[PDB]
Amino acid sequence: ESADLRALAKHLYDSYIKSFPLTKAKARAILTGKTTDKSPFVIYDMNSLMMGEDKIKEVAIRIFQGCQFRSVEAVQEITEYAKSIPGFVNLDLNDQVTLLKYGVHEIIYTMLASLMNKDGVLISEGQGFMTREFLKSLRKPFGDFMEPKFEFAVKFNALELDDSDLAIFIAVIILSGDRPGLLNVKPIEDIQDNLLQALELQLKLNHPESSQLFAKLLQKMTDLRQIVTEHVQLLQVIKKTETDMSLHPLLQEIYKDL
Ligand SMILES: *c1ccc([N+](=O)[O-])cc1C(=O)Nc1ccccc1
Ligand SMILES: CCCCCCCCC(=O)O
């Protein structure tokens, strides 16, 4: 019944608003800088980076540590949103942990896209804005840590998804079932099947003239996979480049190579 699917869509949206403080609707309002109830401070050079302390170790390193702390926050929020996904908390515990461990990064970049345009990315809850170029011009083991994310975002943001869309889509991502090592795949897939039905009907109703958006959205899951693998291997470079650099354990746990 389509009415049951709309109610799951409503449920996940509601829970998405409660778990993610910076929605895409907010992010866009801040970025489309004429709804200026509060506009961001813009970091485009090392000069503004210091003035950013006045409003909102090595430069690229502590840029990287701040990006790192934010990932911990995002994982926390994603973990909270997952629990609201019906059936998720009744799966085997080891699989719950496995679904998060692999799903978290794919979600982080889906939602990072909402904070991006071609020119840069919102930071500090939308109080700041770092330009693509300032990042791209960081020192070589850090200069390229965000460019593929910018590349994905512009492609992803062209589908014009709104938060109610994304809520269902990031639920589809967690409840995958092809994650390495799942003890009990079939109940995952029954959940995901219901999420996909939810997503299908949501995309149809919310975007009636956007042909095969559903398919175009699922296809985007290959772009996400590649970005994650690109990311983990640049992380292991930096681990050997600076054996004095430290990585949050919640992030370490998620990072098991191979
Ligand atoms: C940036 C650098 C390093 C990591 N990491 O060690 O996992 C993560 C990030 C990153 O993408 N942070 C982030 C997540 C969500 C929103 C803004 C920034
Ligand atoms: C939404 C808060 C983001 C603050 C993290 C600062 C660096 C973020 C990044 O470069 O991706």
Author numbering: 207 to 262, 275 to 476
Quote the original article:
GW9662 is an antagonist that covalently binds to C285 located in, and blocks ligand binding to, the orthosteric pocket. We solved two new crystal structures of PPARγ bound to GW9662 and SR16832, an analog of GW9662 that we developed with a ligand extension that weakens synthetic ligand binding to the alternate site, at 2.29 Å and 2.73 Å, respectively. Similar to our edaglitazone crystal structure, we observed electron density consistent with a bound bacterial MCFA in both structures, which we modeled as C9. In chain A of our GW9662-bound structure, one C9 is present within the branch II region of the orthosteric pocket; in chain B, there are two C9 molecules present, one in branch II and another closer to the cobound position in our edaglitazone structure. Despite this limitation, chemical shift perturbations were observed for residues near the crystallized C9 binding modes observed in the GW9662 and SR16832 crystal structures, including residues on helix 2b/β-sheet surface such as I249, L255, G258, L340, G344, G346, and M348, confirming the crystallized C9 binding modes. When PPARγ was preincubated with GW9662, the fatty acids similarly caused a concentration-dependent increase. In support of this hydrogen bond network, we performed density functional theory (DFT) calculations, which revealed a net attractive interaction between C9 and the SR16832 methoxy group (10.3 kcal/mol) and a repulsive interaction with the phenyl moiety of GW9662 (8.56 kcal/mol).
Thiazolidinediones (TZDs), also called glitazones, are synthetic agonists of the peroxisome proliferator-activated receptor gamma (PPARγ) nuclear receptor with potent anti-diabetic efficacy in patients with type 2 diabetes. Overall, the structure of the PPARγ LBD is described as a three-layer helical sandwich fold composed of 12 α-helices containing a dynamic or flexible internal ligand-binding pocket. The PPARγ ligand-binding pocket is among the largest in the nuclear receptor superfamily, ranging from 1200 to 1400 Å3 in crystal structures with three branches described as ‘T’ or ‘Y’ shaped. Branch I is located proximal to helix 12, which forms a critical part of the activation function-2 (AF-2) coregulator binding surface; branch II is located near the β-sheet surface, close to the predicted ligand entry/exit site where helix 3 meets helix 6 and the helix 11/12 loop; and branch III is also located near the β-sheet surface but deeper in the pocket near helix 5.
